[PDB]
Amino acid sequence: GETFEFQAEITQLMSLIINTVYSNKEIFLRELISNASDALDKIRYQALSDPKQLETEPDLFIRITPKPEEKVLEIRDSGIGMTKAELINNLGTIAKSGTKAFMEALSAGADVSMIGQFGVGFYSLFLVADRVQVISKNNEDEQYIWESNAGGSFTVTLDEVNERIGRGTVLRLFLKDDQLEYLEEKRIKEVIKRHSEFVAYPIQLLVTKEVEVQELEELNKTKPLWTRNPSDITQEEYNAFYKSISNDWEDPLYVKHFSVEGQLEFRAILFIPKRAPFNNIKLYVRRVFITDEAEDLIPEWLSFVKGVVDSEDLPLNLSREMLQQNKIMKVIRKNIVKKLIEAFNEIAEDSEQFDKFYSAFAKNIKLGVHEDTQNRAALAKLLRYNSTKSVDELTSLTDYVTRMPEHQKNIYYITGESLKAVEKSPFLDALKAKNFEVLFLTDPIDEYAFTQLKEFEGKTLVDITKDFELEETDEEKAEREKEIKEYEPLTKALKDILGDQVEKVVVSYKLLDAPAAIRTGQFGWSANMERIMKAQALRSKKTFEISPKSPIIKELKKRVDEGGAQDKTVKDLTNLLFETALLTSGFSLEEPTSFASRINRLISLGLNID
Amino acid sequence: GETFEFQAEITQLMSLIINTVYSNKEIFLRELISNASDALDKIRYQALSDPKQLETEPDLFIRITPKPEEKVLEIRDSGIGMTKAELINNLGTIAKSGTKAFMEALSAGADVSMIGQFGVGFYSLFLVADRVQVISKNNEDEQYIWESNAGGSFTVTLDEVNERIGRGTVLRLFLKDDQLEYLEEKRIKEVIKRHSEFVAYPIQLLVTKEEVQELEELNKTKPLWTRNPSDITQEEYNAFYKSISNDWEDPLYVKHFSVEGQLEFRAILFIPKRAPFNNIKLYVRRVFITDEAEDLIPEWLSFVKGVVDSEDLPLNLSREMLQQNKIMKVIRKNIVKKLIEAFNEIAEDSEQFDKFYSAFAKNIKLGVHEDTQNRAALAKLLRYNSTKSVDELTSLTDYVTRMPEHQKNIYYITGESLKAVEKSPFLDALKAKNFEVLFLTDPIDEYAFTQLKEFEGKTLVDITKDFELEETDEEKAEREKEIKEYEPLTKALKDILGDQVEKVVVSYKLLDAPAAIRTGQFGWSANMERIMKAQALRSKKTFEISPKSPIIKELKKRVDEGGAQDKTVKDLTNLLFETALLTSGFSLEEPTSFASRINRLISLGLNID
Amino acid sequence: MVVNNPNNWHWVDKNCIGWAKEYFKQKLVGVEAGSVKDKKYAKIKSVSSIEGDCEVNQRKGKVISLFDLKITVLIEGHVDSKDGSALPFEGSINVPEVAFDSEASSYQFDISIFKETSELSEAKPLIRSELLPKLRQIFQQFGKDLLATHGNDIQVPESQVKSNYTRGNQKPQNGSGNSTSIYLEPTFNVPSSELYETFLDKQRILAWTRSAQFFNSGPKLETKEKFELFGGNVISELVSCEKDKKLVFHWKLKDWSAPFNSTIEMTFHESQEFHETKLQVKWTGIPVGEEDRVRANFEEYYVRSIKLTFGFGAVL
Amino acid sequence: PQNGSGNSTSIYLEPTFNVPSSELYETFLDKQRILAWTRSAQFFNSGPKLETKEKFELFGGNVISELVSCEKDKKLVFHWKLKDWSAPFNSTIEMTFHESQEFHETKLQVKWTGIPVGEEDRVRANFEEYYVRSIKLTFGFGAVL
Ligand SMILES: Nc1ncnc2c1ncn2[C@@H]1O[C@H](COP(=O)(O)OP(=O)(O)NP(=O)(O)O)[C@@H](O)[C@H]1O
Ligand SMILES: Nc1ncnc2c1ncn2[C@@H]1O[C@H](COP(=O)(O)OP(=O)(O)NP(=O)(O)O)[C@@H](O)[C@H]1O
Ligand SMILES: [K+]
Ligand SMILES: [K+]
Ligand SMILES: [Mg+2]
Numbered sequence A: 001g002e003t004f005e006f007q008a009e010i011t012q013l014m015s016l017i018i019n020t021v022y023s024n025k026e027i028f029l030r031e032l033i034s035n036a037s038d039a040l041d042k043i044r045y046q047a048l049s050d051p052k053q054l055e056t057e058p059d060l061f062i063r064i065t066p067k068p069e070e071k072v073l074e075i076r077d078s079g080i081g082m083t084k085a086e087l088i089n090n091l092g093t094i095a096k097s098g099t100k101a102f103m104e105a106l107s108a109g110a111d112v113s114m115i116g117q118f119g120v121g122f123y124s125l126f127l128v129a130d131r132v133q134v135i136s137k138n139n140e141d142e143q144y145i146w147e148s149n150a151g152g153s154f155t156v157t158l159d160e161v162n163e164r165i166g167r168g169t170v171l172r173l174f175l176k177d178d179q180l181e182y183l184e185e186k187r188i189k190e191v192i193k194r195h196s197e198f199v200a201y202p203i204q205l206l207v208t209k210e211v212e213v214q215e216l217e218e219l220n221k222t223k224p225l226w227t228r229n230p231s232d233i234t235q236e237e238y239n240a241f242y243k244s245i246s247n248d249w250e251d252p253l254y255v256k257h258f259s260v261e262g263q264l265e266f267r268a269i270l271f272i273p274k275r276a277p278f279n280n281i282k283l284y285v286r287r288v289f290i291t292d293e294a295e296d297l298i299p300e301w302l303s304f305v306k307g308v309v310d311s312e313d314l315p316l317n318l319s320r321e322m323l324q325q326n327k328i329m330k331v332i333r334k335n336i337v338k339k340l341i342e343a344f345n346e347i348a349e350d351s352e353q354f355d356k357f358y359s360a361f362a363k364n365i366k367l368g369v370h371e372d373t374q375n376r377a378a379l380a381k382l383l384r385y386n387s388t389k390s391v392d393e394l395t396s397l398t399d400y401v402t403r404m405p406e407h408q409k410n411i412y413y414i415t416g417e418s419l420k421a422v423e424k425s426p427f428l429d430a431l432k433a434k435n436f437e438v439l440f441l442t443d444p445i446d447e448y449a450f451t452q453l454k455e456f457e458g459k460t461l462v463d464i465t466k467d468f469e470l471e472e473t474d475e476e477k478a479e480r481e482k483e484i485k486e487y488e489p490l491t492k493a494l495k496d497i498l499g500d501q502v503e504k505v506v507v508s509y510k511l512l513d514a515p516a517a518i519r520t521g522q523f524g525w526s527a528n529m530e531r532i533m534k535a536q537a538l539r540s541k542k543t544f545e546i547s548p549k550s551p552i553i554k555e556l557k558k559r560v561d562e563g564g565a566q567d568k569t570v571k572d573l574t575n576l577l578f579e580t581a582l583l584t585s586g587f588s589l590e591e592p593t594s595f596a597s598r599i600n601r602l603i604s605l606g607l608n609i610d
Numbered sequence B: 001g002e003t004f005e006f007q008a009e010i011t012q013l014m015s016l017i018i019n020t021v022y023s024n025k026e027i028f029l030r031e032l033i034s035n036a037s038d039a040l041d042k043i044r045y046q047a048l049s050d051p052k053q054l055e056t057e058p059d060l061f062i063r064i065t066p067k068p069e070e071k072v073l074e075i076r077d078s079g080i081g082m083t084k085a086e087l088i089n090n091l092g093t094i095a096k097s098g099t100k101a102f103m104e105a106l107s108a109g110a111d112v113s114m115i116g117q118f119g120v121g122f123y124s125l126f127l128v129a130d131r132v133q134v135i136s137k138n139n140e141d142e143q144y145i146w147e148s149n150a151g152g153s154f155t156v157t158l159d160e161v162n163e164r165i166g167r168g169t170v171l172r173l174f175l176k177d178d179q180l181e182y183l184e185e186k187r188i189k190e191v192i193k194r195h196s197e198f199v200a201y202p203i204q205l206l207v208t209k210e211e212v213q214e215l216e217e218l219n220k221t222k223p224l225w226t227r228n229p230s231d232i233t234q235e236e237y238n239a240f241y242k243s244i245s246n247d248w249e250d251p252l253y254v255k256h257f258s259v260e261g262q263l264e265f266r267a268i269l270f271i272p273k274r275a276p277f278n279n280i281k282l283y284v285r286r287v288f289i290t291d292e293a294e295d296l297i298p299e300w301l302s303f304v305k306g307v308v309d310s311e312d313l314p315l316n317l318s319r320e321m322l323q324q325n326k327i328m329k330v331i332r333k334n335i336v337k338k339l340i341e342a343f344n345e346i347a348e349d350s351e352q353f354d355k356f357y358s359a360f361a362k363n364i365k366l367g368v369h370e371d372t373q374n375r376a377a378l379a380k381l382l383r384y385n386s387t388k389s390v391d392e393l394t395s396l397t398d399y400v401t402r403m404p405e406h407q408k409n410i411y412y413i414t415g416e417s418l419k420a421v422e423k424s425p426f427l428d429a430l431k432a433k434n435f436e437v438l439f440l441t442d443p444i445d446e447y448a449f450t451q452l453k454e455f456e457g458k459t460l461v462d463i464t465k466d467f468e469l470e471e472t473d474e475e476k477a478e479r480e481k482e483i484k485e486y487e488p489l490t491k492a493l494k495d496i497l498g499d500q501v502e503k504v505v506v507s508y509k510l511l512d513a514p515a516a517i518r519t520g521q522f523g524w525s526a527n528m529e530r531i532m533k534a535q536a537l538r539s540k541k542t543f544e545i546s547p548k549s550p551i552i553k554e555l556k557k558r559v560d561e562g563g564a565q566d567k568t569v570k571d572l573t574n575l576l577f578e579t580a581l582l583t584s585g586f587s588l589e590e591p592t593s594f595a596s597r598i599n600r601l602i603s604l605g606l607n608i609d
Numbered sequence C: 001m002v003v004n005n006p007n008n009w010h011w012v013d014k015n016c017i018g019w020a021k022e023y024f025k026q027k028l029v030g031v032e033a034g035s036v037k038d039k040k041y042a043k044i045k046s047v048s049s050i051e052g053d054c055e056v057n058q059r060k061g062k063v064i065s066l067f068d069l070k071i072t073v074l075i076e077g078h079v080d081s082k083d084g085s086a087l088p089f090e091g092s093i094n095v096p097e098v099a100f101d102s103e104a105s106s107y108q109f110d111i112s113i114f115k116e117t118s119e120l121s122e123a124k125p126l127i128r129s130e131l132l133p134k135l136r137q138i139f140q141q142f143g144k145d146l147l148a149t150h151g152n153d154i155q156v157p158e159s160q161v162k163s164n165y166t167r168g169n170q171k172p173q174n175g176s177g178n179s180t181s182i183y184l185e186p187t188f189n190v191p192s193s194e195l196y197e198t199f200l201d202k203q204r205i206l207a208w209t210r211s212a213q214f215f216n217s218g219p220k221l222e223t224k225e226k227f228e229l230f231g232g233n234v235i236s237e238l239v240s241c242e243k244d245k246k247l248v249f250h251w252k253l254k255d256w257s258a259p260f261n262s263t264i265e266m267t268f269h270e271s272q273e274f275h276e277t278k279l280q281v282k283w284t285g286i287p288v289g290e291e292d293r294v295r296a297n298f299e300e301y302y303v304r305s306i307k308l309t310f311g312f313g314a315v316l
Numbered sequence D: 001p002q003n004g005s006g007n008s009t010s011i012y013l014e015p016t017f018n019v020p021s022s023e024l025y026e027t028f029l030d031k032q033r034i035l036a037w038t039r040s041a042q043f044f045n046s047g048p049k050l051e052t053k054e055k056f057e058l059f060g061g062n063v064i065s066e067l068v069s070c071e072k073d074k075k076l077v078f079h080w081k082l083k084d085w086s087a088p089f090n091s092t093i094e095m096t097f098h099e100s101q102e103f104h105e106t107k108l109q110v111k112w113t114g115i116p117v118g119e120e121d122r123v124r125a126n127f128e129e130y131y132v133r134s135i136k137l138t139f140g141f142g143a144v145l
């Protein structure tokens, strides 16, 4: 019937674009620096074909001059400038991006990396400025003044009351009474060090010293390293770059600089620090900081690494500080983890460098084995622990299976409080007799990784603290069954005394010197796991096994056949051996006062005290 | 100088609202349901002054009828509708909000709170649809059709081929090929439950069952913040809690308050019965904005559930985040102030506070360690066991009430469990002087006591560490005379242990135990050292003996006979030292050596040579 | 579809996970290894599951695709036998990932043959000889045609584009709803002996729930026995159960209406190799607007509640 | 306007440590104890403890400090400067001890002056990590959660 055209309410669109688009008010400085960088790229692209276009102002700089006495924040650049028509068409029309039209005029494959693509980034200055006095100057026109106060209208007047400039645009910002914080030296340097730190052109800031001459300081003192080949970059440049992306004081332990070319164009310079920071990976589009709270970019267990990611081509939002329904992050997530795992393997090739990396990020590597599943096998080869044959240095799981004999089919390990407790545990005597290497786990996060891997190159991970069965000859099983049957009333005697403290009393041959020990029933929390869960701030049955070769156990067996199943002297000694085995196996002792009373009675008995 | 005006490039501005904003694509359903609620509020406001306006379609509803056969998502409402001129101005001009123009034309003190203020929310349906067919019908006009293909032009044609409706607006969304997920009942109810769950008007959904189609009301639970907390019953709060959160159980306590003035906002805060180990959602104009606000609720108080319905909040163009305005801190302190007052009301009840303290013991004590402004208010809720409260729990204010006149410090003790601290040898000293000692069993108790440091003028003193007590003039001379007599014994125990202890002093705070180990009142306690050495995500010792114990007296007799370097005196010294570590809460290094000593005493008792 | 992108400058997304599944349903099937007359033969019959991402995008006129799918298929066939004619066999092929920049040597294939015997040792070199090269050319061609069918749906023709930069880059009454069903497999480090009694012994049920109301005085749960959980809000009834192998419950929430009554089917898959048990829970009958609520709470009131009260596994 | 540098600013911190003033004072001077909470230190003199007008590098050599004045467990003034800082920029940090015998704590009033304008937030967050939390976790002089 009737066909109409879409219109726009100018008196209301200006309020929506300025006030209800950007979250923070400091974003206005990022867009004005980005617009200055785009204008400098236009005159630089024309200087390659016309050197006379750069003779009026050969220095390509960005100068910021705050004036507290006048409440004016002046931002001057030496870009291409705007003519009289561009101040009305490009700058006067909302959503009109002239820099985008300049990118569409040239052929595909140029060396242009301009930032301006939407066309509503200039109006963000009105969040802090009441009225603007943008002054422009082009080579093919005169010098004009663009005055506006976000009141639905602007005026363009020929400049005759201001200083003559060679080429570029001068942005005069009359800040409001409540936005006078952007006139000091501190607030200006915070926004530059946050959004426009890696601008290719130098950003000059006019500071005022004390008696009080005003000077110019380059805010962007570090140049972006992703624009260069990683082979030409030395070690000193990577250290200064790490001290700029983060607030750390020390040098990075390892640098991983890669670049993926193809369907997805993005670069990343990932740094591995020397200590754990206990986000960290920032994202940059067109060499401009977008956001650092990307959760689908880097895993949580891998978030210890520092660095930034240059991903110039990405879907940006109108606020230009958030990405839209990030399905590309999953492609960058798998690429960052893949490059970091390959970087971790390169560190593993060295001996002095991997010792510092593993000692500082031992928890982070083991957290990946517990949480990550697709890359669990790659991270398992990086685990380094101690063993009975590796008491001096840390050994890997790959070196463990190399020293495994031909008759061993499982990987034995043991957990505990510290290294001194697991090295003298009575559970190692059985494996040392059969020449079986047993790993040592000292950190509380070791158990959470082993109950998720469950297999390394076909070898099943078995904990010697739990109930496990060893392989022996057939003639040994025959003679051992007779001793267990002979010690049957001895095991039944220890069961009724302890009661519900243990699940069962069996004769175990995995003990050589210790009289008895306690093991878990292969299900539940182990001796170390139960103690750890009961000691967390933000947050199983026991098996009594005796050794048939100990002289104490043989003496207790002699008391059973003599009718000493209910004697007072035997009940004290069986409870004494039970609570003593709990201390060696790693269990928490209940009511240690009564256990100390048994020791005090033994001390008095030795001192001839009646 | 010529004075021009600001223009707008329609062909580019339209793309700025289509494929540059609204990060998520499910926002189109929320803004369309919100547009239906505003239209229903306009016809409802006119029905109070003109009942004839609500006579065409008296039933107010919002119907959503998905059609997977032709890929059409139809959304019909019975609002005021749009005339032929409104489809060109209100629905054909960017940033033109007819809803906001209707609010500014009302009277003073209106009860209607519409959502439409921006004017660009209607162009969000193009994220999932390539073309829309809006069918409107007003009382003072005919039924028209608003057709557009998300381009730069639209057509308005008189409706003569579709079904005649009484009053309202029908939106036919021709979904794209990749956005066909919004034609199923799962995605439809998911966005409504997430964004438009608390619309005042019922949202009807045409669901096909196994071809008998029926209508289900998606918003079954009406919002409760628009009502007074007095007439709201208990079962209404339980059904409301099960809707804002996926919890199955009933809320333990409900804190519904309302702040008036320049920051009028409603908030119904729920306290669950079990710890959920964000949780507080934000609502503006009966529309869910976001729940990722980190400055709205403290970290230690993140266990509380509920929503906060405010009105004066600066929203962005997408209505999914809040801008920095230095106002969330005012709502932050008001939430904590009301919850602290709510926690005090729970403390008035015995059965209600027992379930709250036993379920959120870590959260209450975490605020004492983290928060400092309300640290004294949170200390009133701390409950612990003691020597005089072995059965039930007692508060810190009840502890000072039972304190004698000669006591000036609050004594406590840390440990791993209640059975370990109840039999500790450090209690015999305070029990003799009739001093109550609290029992700290949780690992977070020491983190809270190391930050409070004072309760009603009483300094918190840990009996595990080194401290001093009161003593009469007759005992101060007797203790000094006995310490200098046992001086060679203290030096005899020092060189044997060496660096294992800092100093060996004769202590009189032990009655039954012959020896004990203390921290030193400056270092980490035995429990604190054990906690740090057991965290998955992550001090000097003092040897004090009791001069009244028969074991210590026998060890003193061996010193004067030249037995300072004997083999038997060195075995008993290391045995007694490591035994005191088990009672004080320390972990024994190399427990195999300690077991080898016990095995040798077993052989001595069994007449084994 | 209608795309309003002047000069194709803005990022326009188009999900193609649906079309990708239908493309593999007509390309992976029907391909065979060898012939039926030979003693060795195999052929894929159907695709097991297609999970991942498959979307096409455009930035400045170039059709980019960053798809990443997890392809798994079921394969049949027969191998040589020592006695009698050839014996049939079944198996499955598991692909880790199919990316956009993957080469021919990058595609991996996890061979999963059912009923592994020593006679079927020649089954692995069979698929690696003629079947694997046939799957590589299909995966490589998947990137070419994907940009050919969905590439024209976006990037409007150059007749309406006035940008040379982008041009050079182009190549009924009121009622209720129906129900649904979910499927999960939580892992527990516990044998099926006590894991079965965990859901039956009333003394143990009150441990990981802390709130229960049993109507009968029986020691443990029996068939056709109702009991309320979580303050009477969770109403479930045991109707069928096997000895440590099957558990069937009639789960029902108090907020649900009368015609809604879900059914939980628990199956025990204890493996003595790793000392664990995978409890396959086949939950059906849940409303469509309640399957996400009962699933997120099952990992908190049923999975983590048991692993923390009885210690049947460590969680962090 | 010529090319130069910016101005200077100041901060004030008061971290609470659970350690007497006698032991905490020796922590910042004993070279054997400095290597514990710093994990890397380079001293140029053979002295057992730090003396007046003595320079030493910390944290791999990026942090240059120098003791210019100190009292008996009461005052500790160091000249703090970073490696990436310019030549004219040289900050001075003062440490004042306040032993509280009633609570068994020591509030170390830190008066740090001479910090560059842009380098303000960097030296404040890292001070709580390399100086405050590092000593509390190495010697057990405070509970960190
Ligand atoms: N300092 C400047 N020098 C020259 N031209 C400028 C300057 N600042 C803005 N312009 C012009 O103003 C136009 C409008 O740009 P603007 O409104 O800032 O958004 P945009 O840069 O085009 N896109 P975006 O920055 O992503 O929001 C640009 O296309 C330039 O031609
Ligand atoms: N279903 C409807 N029935 C009647 N009028 C409607 C309907 N939807 C939209 N309108 C009209 O269209 C105008 C444009 O609203 P809209 O573009 O959706 O933005 P808004 O709702 O006013 N504010 P916002 O949604 O935050 O952008 C409204 O003010 C109404 O006058
Ligand atoms: K513009
Ligand atoms: K509109
Ligand atoms: Mg701009």
Ligand SMILES: [Mg+2]
Binding pocket: B031, B032, B034, B035, B116, B120, B121, B122
């Ligand atoms: Mg709207």
